[PDB]
Amino acid sequence: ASMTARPLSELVERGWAAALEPVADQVAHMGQFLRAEIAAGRRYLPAGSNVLRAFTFPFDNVRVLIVGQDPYPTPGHAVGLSFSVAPDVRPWPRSLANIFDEYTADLGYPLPSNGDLTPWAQRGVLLLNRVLTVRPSNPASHRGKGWEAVTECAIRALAARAAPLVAILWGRDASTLKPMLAAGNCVAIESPHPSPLSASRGFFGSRPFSRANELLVGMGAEPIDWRLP
Ligand SMILES: O=c1cc[nH]c(=O)[nH]1
Numbered sequence: 696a697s698m699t700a701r702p703l704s705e706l707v708e709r710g711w712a713a714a715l716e717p718v719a720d721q722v723a724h725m726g727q728f729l730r731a732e733i734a735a736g737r738r739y740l741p742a743g744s745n746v747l748r749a750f751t752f753p754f755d756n757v758r759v760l761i762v763g764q765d766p767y768p769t770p771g772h773a774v775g776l777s778f779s780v781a782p783d784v785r786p787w788p789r790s791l792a793n794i795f796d797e798y799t800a801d802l803g804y805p806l807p808s809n810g811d812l813t814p815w816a817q818r819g820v821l822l823l824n825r826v827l828t829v830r831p832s833n834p835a836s837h838r839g840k841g842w843e844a845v846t847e848c849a850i851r852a853l854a855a856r857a858a859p860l861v862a863i864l865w866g867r868d869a870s871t872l873k874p875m876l877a878a879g880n881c882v883a884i885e886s887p888h889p890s891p892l893s894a895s896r897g898f899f900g901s902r903p904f905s906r907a908n909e910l911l912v913g914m915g916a917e918p919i920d921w922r923l924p
């Protein structure tokens with residue numbers, strides 16, 4: 696699963712491998728960056744085999760994109776799908792608790808049983824971050840190190856598809872993708888990030904899930920079934 700050693704066709708789903716062809720060298724460079732970090736004595740999250748995990752769900756099937764900032768900084772939380780945690784993790788990360796608070800407020804569903812968001816990924820929600828790795832315990836430590844070109848390419852490719860797309864952009868770094876979503880087949884929702892530092896500035900009450908579904912059906916697409924166990 697090494698980004699430095701193997702090509703996109705062997706790392707990600709077929710549609711994604713084609714979509715990310717323009718950043719093939721950049722992805723290899725990121726693998727070399729992570730190698731250099733480890734040689735220097737610094738770690739990264741998520742685990743190497745999970746870094747590109749969002750791109751293992753089919754490119755063609757994406758209907759909604761959620762974009763955050765960067766992975767969870769606590770070892771054992773980040774799994775390569777933004778905001779998700781393994782089903783045995785608890786307490787939940789604070790931003791996930793905030794996401795779930797808004798989920799219940801918006802949709803009226805019960806609080807989820809755990810923090811595993813794979814059902815969303817399986818239903819065509821792409822769970823991206825603007826930056827795909829972080830040093831443990833150091834939020835935003837890999838900002839500006841080369842991932843932004845990769846996630847820009849992902850968005851640009853999604854937007855070029857002959858398909859509707861609704862994007863939910865959480866926070867400042869995610870919102871730098873908005874210009875790439877300007878085409879008529881794409882709509883973006885942006886809000887403050889669900890982190891405690893920002894959530895009270897406009898994440899709570901933002902109702903992104905029902906808004907995304909209104910947007911999807913307005914484009915002639917089926918809505919996301921957001922319901923989690
Ligand atoms: O994946 C994650 C987790 C925390 N914060 C983010 O922006 N994304």
Ligand SMILES: [Cl-]
Nearest residue numbers: 866867868888
């Ligand atoms: Cl932010």
